Design a protein around this ligand. Structure first.
Ligand code: BTN
Ligand code: BTN
Lengths: 179, 179
């Protein structure tokens, strides 16, 4: 549905569910495949910026175990919104088809290589190096790249060892979610 | 005295003083100029490894304001031992003569460029780029490079705003300093 893109309505449902599970110590499993946000004036006039921040906050605030699996696409700011490891996640696995980037190869090459000759060669070079899960994994964004058939067993193992995990957070009178 | 090198005796005196000042909310000011550790069997047989860890711990544990000024040399592991910014420091200033490196240019070039022709050119290139305070500052190791005449005023300003600073640390029954 809608290429797996985030919009206002999806952000509202996600943030509410995540917030409940965190409050009552229920671990979270995230399956990420998101190419970006739904474009258009229907979303911009509706406050897509304000509403998208709801899901980002709901994950960032969480203190319960978070296990993320990236199945195919994670472009742009949506990578971090869908519970990336940099929001105090516990484990993050990629399948062999995962691709983590600011944008797809076509947009990135047209912007990076502007006015140069032999752009088609630059397009092939960029895709071969960046259109896979490796530029993120070699940086510590992904803990392992796993065969999909092993996903269940890998998650079960993490759940049975993160269950006793506690973290500290500064004192606050109460949270201030963007609303 | 002894080129400003750390040894067993200096580590013992430092750790004890730092620990007292931290316990009773007295800010710390550090003036760093340390080329490394005193070599030789007299120090190795005396447990220089064990004793040096005392000063590293004493700074790392501290929760009171820490302001560090680097005047000239900070080579090797001694950089971090003498209250570097990466031990939860508040501010760290360098004077124009500061040099932060793993080792001096002579040792580094002989190790990096081994068996190559025109080593003398490599020596000049290395010194011009790394024998100054810039490769550390551009990475976030140093907050500013200041004229020495302004040091006092800069420190006074930091002390009058860090005085109300509190940090959180996980619960512990009691500390376990290497001894
Ligand atoms: C064709 O150029 C339309 C591109 C839309 C691709 C998807 S839709 C939502 C995401 N936002 C974006 O700019 N690209 C993604
Ligand atoms: C001559 O080669 C002796 C070099 C000693 C220079 C100083 S003394 C202590 C520090 N340790 C080290 O390897 N170099 C520094």
């Amino acid at each position: 549905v809608a290429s797996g893109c985030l919009d206002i309505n999806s952000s509202v449902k996600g943030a509410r569910f995540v917030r409940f599970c965190d409050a009552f110590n229920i671990p979270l499993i995230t399956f990420v495949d998101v190419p970006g946000f739904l474009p258009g004036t229907a979303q911009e006039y509706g406050g897509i910026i304000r509403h998208g921040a709801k899901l980002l906050y709901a994950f960032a605030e969480a203190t319960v175990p978070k296990v993320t699996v990236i199945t195919r696409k994670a472009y742009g700011g949506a990578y971090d919104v869908m519970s990336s490891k940099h929001l105090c996640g516990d484990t993050n696995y990629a399948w062999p088809t995962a691709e983590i980037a600011v944008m797809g190869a076509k947009g990135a090459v047209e912007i990076i290589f502007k006015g140069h000759e032999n752009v088609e060669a630059a397009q092939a070079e960029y895709i071969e190096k960046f259109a896979n899960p490796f530029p993120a994994a070699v940086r510590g964004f992904v803990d392992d790249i796993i065969q999909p058939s092993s996903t269940r067993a890998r998650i079960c193992c993490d759940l049975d060892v993160l269950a006793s995990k506690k973290v500290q957070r500064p004192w606050r009178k109460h949270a201030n979610i963007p609303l």
